[PDB]
Ligand binder design. Structure first.
Ligand SMILES: [K+]
Ligand SMILES: [K+]
Ligand SMILES: [K+]
Ligand SMILES: [K+]
Ligand SMILES: [K+]
Ligand SMILES: [K+]
Ligand SMILES: [K+]
Ligand SMILES: [K+]
Ligand SMILES: [K+]
Ligand SMILES: [K+]
Ligand SMILES: [K+]
Ligand SMILES: [K+]
Ligand SMILES: [K+]
Ligand SMILES: [K+]
Ligand SMILES: [K+]
Ligand SMILES: [K+]
Ligand SMILES: [K+]
Ligand SMILES: [K+]
Ligand SMILES: [Mg+2]
Ligand SMILES: [Mg+2]
Ligand SMILES: [Mg+2]
Ligand SMILES: [Mg+2]
Ligand SMILES: [Mg+2]
Ligand SMILES: [Mg+2]
Ligand SMILES: [Mg+2]
Ligand SMILES: [Mg+2]
Ligand SMILES: [Mg+2]
Ligand SMILES: [Mg+2]
Ligand SMILES: [Mg+2]
Ligand SMILES: [Mg+2]
Ligand SMILES: [Mg+2]
Ligand SMILES: [Mg+2]
Ligand SMILES: [Mg+2]
Ligand SMILES: [Mg+2]
Ligand SMILES: [Mg+2]
Ligand SMILES: [Mg+2]
Ligand SMILES: [Mg+2]
Ligand SMILES: [Mg+2]
Ligand SMILES: [Mg+2]
Ligand SMILES: [Mg+2]
Ligand SMILES: [Mg+2]
Ligand SMILES: [Mg+2]
Ligand SMILES: [Mg+2]
Ligand SMILES: [Mg+2]
Ligand SMILES: [Mg+2]
Ligand SMILES: [Mg+2]
Ligand SMILES: [Mg+2]
Ligand SMILES: [Mg+2]
Ligand SMILES: [Mg+2]
Ligand SMILES: [Mg+2]
Ligand SMILES: [Mg+2]
Ligand SMILES: [Mg+2]
Ligand SMILES: [Mg+2]
Ligand SMILES: [Mg+2]
Ligand SMILES: [Mg+2]
Ligand SMILES: [Mg+2]
Ligand SMILES: [Mg+2]
Ligand SMILES: [Mg+2]
Ligand SMILES: [Mg+2]
Ligand SMILES: [Mg+2]
Ligand SMILES: [Mg+2]
Ligand SMILES: [Mg+2]
Ligand SMILES: [Mg+2]
Ligand SMILES: [Mg+2]
Ligand SMILES: [Mg+2]
Ligand SMILES: [Mg+2]
Ligand SMILES: [Mg+2]
Ligand SMILES: [Mg+2]
Ligand SMILES: [Mg+2]
Ligand SMILES: [Mg+2]
Ligand SMILES: [Mg+2]
Ligand SMILES: [Mg+2]
Ligand SMILES: [Mg+2]
Ligand SMILES: [Mg+2]
Ligand SMILES: [Mg+2]
Ligand SMILES: [Mg+2]
Ligand SMILES: [Mg+2]
Ligand SMILES: [Mg+2]
Ligand SMILES: [Mg+2]
Ligand SMILES: [Mg+2]
Ligand SMILES: [Mg+2]
Ligand SMILES: [Mg+2]
Ligand SMILES: [Mg+2]
Ligand SMILES: [Mg+2]
Ligand SMILES: [Mg+2]
Ligand SMILES: [Mg+2]
Ligand SMILES: [Mg+2]
Ligand SMILES: [Mg+2]
Ligand SMILES: [Mg+2]
Ligand SMILES: [Mg+2]
Ligand SMILES: [Mg+2]
Ligand SMILES: [Mg+2]
Ligand SMILES: [Mg+2]
Ligand SMILES: [Mg+2]
Ligand SMILES: [Mg+2]
Ligand SMILES: [Mg+2]
Ligand SMILES: [Mg+2]
Ligand SMILES: [Mg+2]
Ligand SMILES: [Mg+2]
Ligand SMILES: [Zn+2]
Lengths: 83, 99, 208, 104
RNA sequence: UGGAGAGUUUGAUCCUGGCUCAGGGUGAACGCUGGCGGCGUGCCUAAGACAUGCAAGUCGUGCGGGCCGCGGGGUUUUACUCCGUGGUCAGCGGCGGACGGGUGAGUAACGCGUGGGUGACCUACCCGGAAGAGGGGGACAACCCGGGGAAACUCGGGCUAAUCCCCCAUGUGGACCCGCCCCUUGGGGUGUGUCCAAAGGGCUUUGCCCGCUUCCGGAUGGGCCCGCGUCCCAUCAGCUAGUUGGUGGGGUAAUGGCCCACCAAGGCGACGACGGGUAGCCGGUCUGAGAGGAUGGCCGGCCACAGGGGCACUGAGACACGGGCCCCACUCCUACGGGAGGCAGCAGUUAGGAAUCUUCCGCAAUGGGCGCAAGCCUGACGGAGCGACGCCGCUUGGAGGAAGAAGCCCUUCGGGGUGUAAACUCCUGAACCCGGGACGAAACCCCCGACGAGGGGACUGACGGUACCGGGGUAAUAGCGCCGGCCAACUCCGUGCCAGCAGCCGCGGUAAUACGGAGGGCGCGAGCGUUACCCGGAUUCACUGGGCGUAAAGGGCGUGUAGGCGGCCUGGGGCGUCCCAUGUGAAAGACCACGGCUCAACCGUGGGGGAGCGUGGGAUACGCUCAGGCUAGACG
């Protein structure tokens, strides 16, 4: 099914992923459907994680299945925080 | 060597057989009703047309015909029968056709 | 492989005096006093009217031999300058003038640019409190260039920074001699520098 | 949108099918001067409704046959062989350039 | 924000004109030389041939067994036999094996690009909604018994479970025929007739979970169709019979000569058909002032292919690289009957070649498959290795001080040069089996909560003892090309049209800045040169931006076909043309800004531009077209 996962974009030893919405079958760094965030595993800057939660919510509403690590990050930005 | 997923080949043959057999019936019954309809024998032509209809749908129950392949068949069948019965037919058993 | 070879001989070939030793290139010994003529078995022979190319080439060699940079890095900067907005000539001289090793020389933390280079490579210098051992590190306005505490007590750093007491510093810079600190106030203007160089001839050299 | 083109009927010799010659004008990609180019289309005509000289509007349609993906959307103006003749002569022209040749 | 030219035809000149050089580039190779690191990058030839290992499996929460083992039952005892549980094997069944990975052979084509069409369509798993799962029946492996073969492997007989297969039922609904209505290609509603559903499993077992069935929709993915665009040769000019169309049928998810039967005689071409050559196309890349030229490696998108050819089976999906069948070529086993194979997956071998790497580490991270989960698989990937192949950074010292050399090697023999240069005095301190030592990794899981939201919790690092920090600490690689002009750098000796140099002009015939050596000099520097190829200079195919009296170039002349071009006035239309709005123009790249690694290369975030095409609206001077008029062209 269509997923919400990470796509590698940094450099050697300098990873930077894109929180992406793509068909499960594509290369990971392949052609996605829509970028909805980005993540810096090493927090090299204060802005090491952003997520268009409105959009994340959209895709989930239509079947988007997040990777575990994908889900984990989305949550960290309150994609599920209904509180 | 020895890729145990040759079990798929193994299985395909069993399936091939299943499908193959279901179709023969379908083809054979259809021809049979189309044959009767034409010969003007209405009540039995429909009787069989009805079996063929059922068999076809069932074929599409699983992966033998599925899709709209079933629909085409029934369509062409109910087509030829109703028409061939244009020899003074008069749908006796009013089987599958809805006059 | 930053050159490394006899220096008070480049000045001789360049006609003008290139202070590439700081000290001594002042004393009655810089050779430019006795033998201002180019080096070699023909250095004194009659001069032959140089070609347009010659003029431009020598001028580029002068400006670049001053900062002791490679032709590679030198060219890289010039290209970066052509691309930037603003009179290439100046902008170029600005960038040159922003190399840390250079600024360390302007602040007097060292006699020559060559000496200032070694002082960076050896970590005796600090930008904003953090060590920077890259002679080409580009200093930006506001950055405070200093001397690592551990180096502050170095015999050389003493004689040097001492000799800077009550001594003047370029208008785009500023140094607190005591604390051994210095600030890069802003990019020097063409007017702020006074080098024996017609940078226009250089721009032309890289237009051929 | 399904494409709509306008052309002249230059052929009627087919059952339920007419050949529509469509013209197109445009500046040359490198030389500028506006140049006329054209293509013949085989539009579908169920009622044999159109004849030569007929200027019609061809509409992009679901394939009716190989070499035939358009239907005659309507007539723009009737009879006018000035166009048919033109086409025909250019064709007759070919009846030359080879090994033999006419006299035109 | 953007555009330099020079050498060479003459005794000299101007012009024409070709050749050549200065610049930038390359998946490079070769020569001399070679220290450190980061990031990239590395079979361009034989889509030649391949040993070996690994590269796709996973579910015991769908099912029944075999082998090996332990435990517990029914007996007075044994035999026999019941239950539980562990290891293991495959089998039945399911999902995956159609992705991910490789390559560029074929292809000049709806293959690709761009913009559209589908009332002519499909889409497993995922998401939302509605409805449902009553009853019965069957078989084949496993296993057991027997037969054949050298082997691969195979034939028969018997038994058996299921989420395997079938029958009947229920019919939310859906499919088909006919009618009607609304819509307009096969879209939607409706009525009658007919036809079509299902599977169970797991428990914290009396409600939850995983799953099953039918239907409508969503999402993602895809098929097919269409306008426009896409190399060279016209010393290829005619091409075509399923060929063009029709009717009916077949086939498909679906349109269609896609295929077939019959009918018609059509279709295509100079706006280049047909044929030949060559070639995957694109985002982009290199170059250029631009227009343009050239190109398509790495990365992303699409296509094609999996030893060569043909074919279908199974599937939601393939006509399937590690599935199947046949033909061919080749290798292998053969008891000669007959079998087994396909690295254009990672690594490696061999061949060819000027030339292209480790039979490496890890599954820790991102991603993928299966599973309720634990977890299993993953040569995809993340890393390390090798190669100056590229880009960036960095070192071989810094500051002070002129022995001064048998010989190298200049001279007017007074001196000049190498040169502040100098294993020689002072400073710092690359290297360096010395201390500490990482981010990348917090999820799945567990518990509380309600398997939700929240909240706490074990666990896990290949890279790596690496980076980085702190301590100590040595003065510690330099080479290559060139020095007649273009073109930066000149003298001695040697040689004597020789030996040789040479990009072009040329140099050497006894004073050679041109050969070879030496001193000196210029350029660049872990590189420097060479060869090859691309753009440039070349307005030297000229659209921007050229020419033809004598330099190359007016057709021997005419006639006229196609085509190109078209006087003055008015009106319609609004095709060309122009304007507005809007959609599209993926990401990457490029540009600008800020930011992370000590800088940079490299990377991250954000910003701006944009032709072309689609849609809607508008303008009408000019060009076009239609209509009318004129008389200055033309003709009479
Ligand atoms: K002809
Ligand atoms: K038995
Ligand atoms: K009904
Ligand atoms: K659906
Ligand atoms: K769709
Ligand atoms: K589509
Ligand atoms: K037909
Ligand atoms: K460019
Ligand atoms: K291009
Ligand atoms: K191309
Ligand atoms: K799952
Ligand atoms: K240290
Ligand atoms: K030394
Ligand atoms: K001699
Ligand atoms: K010489
Ligand atoms: K060229
Ligand atoms: K002539
Ligand atoms: K002639
Ligand atoms: Mg299996
Ligand atoms: Mg039969
Ligand atoms: Mg500038
Ligand atoms: Mg007709
Ligand atoms: Mg000449
Ligand atoms: Mg000459
Ligand atoms: Mg002459
Ligand atoms: Mg001459
Ligand atoms: Mg003369
Ligand atoms: Mg010339
Ligand atoms: Mg070597
Ligand atoms: Mg490397
Ligand atoms: Mg290859
Ligand atoms: Mg090979
Ligand atoms: Mg493995
Ligand atoms: Mg067992
Ligand atoms: Mg098993
Ligand atoms: Mg692939
Ligand atoms: Mg190819
Ligand atoms: Mg061809
Ligand atoms: Mg297209
Ligand atoms: Mg399937
Ligand atoms: Mg559902
Ligand atoms: Mg049973
Ligand atoms: Mg058996
Ligand atoms: Mg049996
Ligand atoms: Mg079933
Ligand atoms: Mg109902
Ligand atoms: Mg039923
Ligand atoms: Mg249950
Ligand atoms: Mg048909
Ligand atoms: Mg059909
Ligand atoms: Mg199919
Ligand atoms: Mg055909
Ligand atoms: Mg090819
Ligand atoms: Mg040009
Ligand atoms: Mg450019
Ligand atoms: Mg690619
Ligand atoms: Mg091969
Ligand atoms: Mg094949
Ligand atoms: Mg099938
Ligand atoms: Mg396969
Ligand atoms: Mg294929
Ligand atoms: Mg293989
Ligand atoms: Mg290999
Ligand atoms: Mg060889
Ligand atoms: Mg993993
Ligand atoms: Mg994973
Ligand atoms: Mg370097
Ligand atoms: Mg000396
Ligand atoms: Mg020194
Ligand atoms: Mg010391
Ligand atoms: Mg952490
Ligand atoms: Mg609980
Ligand atoms: Mg939590
Ligand atoms: Mg784990
Ligand atoms: Mg120290
Ligand atoms: Mg010179
Ligand atoms: Mg000789
Ligand atoms: Mg001589
Ligand atoms: Mg010489
Ligand atoms: Mg040109
Ligand atoms: Mg012109
Ligand atoms: Mg000319
Ligand atoms: Mg002549
Ligand atoms: Mg002539
Ligand atoms: Mg003439
Ligand atoms: Mg004419
Ligand atoms: Mg006119
Ligand atoms: Mg005209
Ligand atoms: Mg008009
Ligand atoms: Mg218009
Ligand atoms: Mg636009
Ligand atoms: Mg883009
Ligand atoms: Mg920075
Ligand atoms: Mg930066
Ligand atoms: Mg960006
Ligand atoms: Mg418009
Ligand atoms: Mg108007
Ligand atoms: Mg008008
Ligand atoms: Mg008129
Ligand atoms: Zn000096």
């Amino acid at each position: 099914m269509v997923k919400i996962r990470l796509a590698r974009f940094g450099s050697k030893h300098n990873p930077h992923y894109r929180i992406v919405v793509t068909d499960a079958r594509r290369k990971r760094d392949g052609k996605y459907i829509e970028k909805i965030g980005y993540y810096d595993p090493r927090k090299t800057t204060p802005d090491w994680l952003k997520v268009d939660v409105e959009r994340a919510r959209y895709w989930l509403s239509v079947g988007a299945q997040p990777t575990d690590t994908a889900r984990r990050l989305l949550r960290q930005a309150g994609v599920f925080r209904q509180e | 060597r020895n890729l145990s997923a040759l079990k798929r080949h193994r299985q395909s043959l069993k399936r091939r057989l299943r499908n193959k057999a279901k179709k023969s019936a379908i083809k054979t019954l259809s021809k049979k009703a189309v044959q009767l309809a034409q010969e003007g024998k209405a009540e039995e032509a429909l009787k069989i047309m009805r079996k063929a209809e059922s068999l076809i749908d069932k074929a599409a129950k699983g992966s033998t015909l599925h899709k709209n392949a079933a629909a085409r068949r029934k369509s062409r069948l109910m087509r030829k029968v109703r028409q061939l019965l244009e020899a003074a037919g008069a749908p006796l058993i009013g089987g599958g056709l809805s006059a | 492989g930053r050159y490394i070879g006899p220096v008070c001989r480049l000045c001789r070939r360049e006609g003008v005096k290139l202070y590439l030793k700081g000290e001594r290139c002042y004393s009655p010994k810089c050779a430019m006093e006795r033998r201002p003529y180019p080096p070699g078995q023909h250095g004194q022979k009659r001069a032959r009217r140089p070609s347009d190319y010659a003029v431009r080439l020598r001028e580029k060699q002068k400006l670049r031999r001053i900062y002791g940079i490679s032709e590679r890095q030198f060219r890289n900067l010039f290209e970066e300058a052509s691309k930037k907005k603003g009179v290439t000539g100046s902008v170029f001289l600005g960038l040159l003038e922003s190399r840390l090793d250079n600024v360390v020389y302007r602040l007097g933390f060292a006699v020559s640019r060559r000496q200032a280079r070694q002082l960076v490579r050896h970590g005796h210098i600090t930008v904003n409190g953090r060590r920077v051992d890259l002679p080409s590190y580009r200093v930006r306005p506001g950055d405070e260039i200093a001397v690592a505490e551990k180096s502050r007590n170095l015999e050389l750093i003493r004689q040097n920074l001492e000799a800077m007491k009550g001594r003047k510093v370029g208008p785009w810079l500023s140094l607190d001699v005591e604390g051994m600190k210095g600030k890069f106030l802003r990019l020097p203007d063409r007017e702020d520098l006074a080098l024996p160089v017609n940078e226009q001839l250089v721009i032309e050299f890289y237009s051929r | 949108p399904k494409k709509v083109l306008t052309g002249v009927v230059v052929s009627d010799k087919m059952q339920k099918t007419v050949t529509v010659l469509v013209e197109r004008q445009f500046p040359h990609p490198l030389y500028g001067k506006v140049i006329k180019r054209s293509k013949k289309y085989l539009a579908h005509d169920p009622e044999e409704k159109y004849k030569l000289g007929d200027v019609v509007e061809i509409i992009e349609s679901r394939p009716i046959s190989k070499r035939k993906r358009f239907r005659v959307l309507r007539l723009v103006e009737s009879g006018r062989m000035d166009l048919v003749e033109k086409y025909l002569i250019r064709r007759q022209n070919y009846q030359s350039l080879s090994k033999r040749g006419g006299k035109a």
